[PDB]
Amino acid sequence: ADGKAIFQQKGCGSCHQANVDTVGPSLKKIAQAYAGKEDQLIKFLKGEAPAIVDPAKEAIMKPQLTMLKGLSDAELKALADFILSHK
Amino acid sequence: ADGKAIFQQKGCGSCHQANVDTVGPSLKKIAQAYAGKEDQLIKFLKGEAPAIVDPAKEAIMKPQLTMLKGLSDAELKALADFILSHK
Ligand code: HEC
Ligand code: HEC
Structure with a gap:
C-alpha cells in the first residue's frame, strides 16, 4: 500500500x-x-x-451535569438566567 | 428559585x-x-x-474516520506509518 x-x-x-x-x-x-x-x-x-491529541473537554464538564439532574424546571431556568446575566 | x-x-x-x-x-x-x-x-x-462555546475539535475529526471504512489492515498500517514519519 x-x-x-x-x-x-x-x-x-x-x-x-x-x-x-x-x-x-x-x-x-x-x-x-x-x-x-x-x-x-x-x-x-x-x-x-x-x-488523544485534542480531546474534547466534555470529559471535565460532563460529570458536572450530574449535579443538575434533580433540579426542577424553575431551578434550571433560574440557573440559566444567572448565567445569562453576565454581560 | x-x-x-x-x-x-x-x-x-x-x-x-x-x-x-x-x-x-x-x-x-x-x-x-x-x-x-x-x-x-x-x-x-x-x-x-x-x-457550543468552544465546540469540540474532536467532533470535526470523528466523521472523517468514515473515509477509512473497508481499507485493509495493510492500508491502515501504511496510513499510520505515513503519519508517524512526521515525528
Ligand atoms: C477537517 C475538515 C479534517 C479532515 C478532513 C481530517 N481531519 Fe483529522 N483532525 C481534525 C481535527 C480538528 C483534529 C483534532 C481533533 C482530534 O480528534 O484530535 C484531528 C485529529 C486527527 C488525528 C489525531 C487523533 C487523536 O488522537 O486526537 C488523526 C490521526 C487524524 N486527525 C487523521 C486524519 C485522517 C487519516 C484523515 C483523512 C481520512 C483526517 N484526519 C481528515 C480535522 C480533520
Ligand atoms: C471544572 C472542574 C468544571 C466545573 C466544576 C464546572 N464546569 Fe462547566 N465547563 C467546564 C469546561 C472545561 C467547559 C468546556 C466544555 C464545554 O462543555 O463547553 C465547561 C462548559 C460549561 C458550559 C458551556 C457549555 C457550552 O455550550 O460550551 C456551561 C453552561 C457550564 N459549563 C455550566 C456549568 C455549571 C452549571 C456547573 C456547576 C454544576 C459547571 N459548569 C461546573 C468545566 C467545569
Whole structure:
C-alpha cells in the first residue's frame, strides 16, 4: 500500500499539513502524541480508540451535569438566567 | 428559585469565573454564546445538547474516520506509518 497516497486521496491533507497546525493538528504533532503508542494510532484510524491529541473537554464538564439532574424546571431556568446575566 | 445560589452551592464558580477563562469558559463568554438561545442553555444543562462555546475539535475529526471504512489492515498500517514519519 501507499500511505501518502491514501492520505491525499481521502482528503486528509485539507486539515493536516506536515509541520503546521491548520484546522487540524500538524502530522508532526499527531505523530509525537502517539510515541510509544503506535498500534493505538491504527486503532484510532479504525474508530476503535479515543482521540488523544485534542480531546474534547466534555470529559471535565460532563460529570458536572450530574449535579443538575434533580433540579426542577424553575431551578434550571433560574440557573440559566444567572448565567445569562453576565454581560 | 435562586440561580446564583444554585450555581454557588454546586461549586460551578471554580471553573466559571465572571470575566476570566480558567479550566472552563468565563460566564461572560458562555452568556455571549447563548444570547437569545436560553432554551439551548437549558437543554445543555439537562445533558441534552453538545457544548457550543468552544465546540469540540474532536467532533470535526470523528466523521472523517468514515473515509477509512473497508481499507485493509495493510492500508491502515501504511496510513499510520505515513503519519508517524512526521515525528
Ligand atoms: C477537517 C475538515 C479534517 C479532515 C478532513 C481530517 N481531519 Fe483529522 N483532525 C481534525 C481535527 C480538528 C483534529 C483534532 C481533533 C482530534 O480528534 O484530535 C484531528 C485529529 C486527527 C488525528 C489525531 C487523533 C487523536 O488522537 O486526537 C488523526 C490521526 C487524524 N486527525 C487523521 C486524519 C485522517 C487519516 C484523515 C483523512 C481520512 C483526517 N484526519 C481528515 C480535522 C480533520
Ligand atoms: C471544572 C472542574 C468544571 C466545573 C466544576 C464546572 N464546569 Fe462547566 N465547563 C467546564 C469546561 C472545561 C467547559 C468546556 C466544555 C464545554 O462543555 O463547553 C465547561 C462548559 C460549561 C458550559 C458551556 C457549555 C457550552 O455550550 O460550551 C456551561 C453552561 C457550564 N459549563 C455550566 C456549568 C455549571 C452549571 C456547573 C456547576 C454544576 C459547571 N459548569 C461546573 C468545566 C467545569
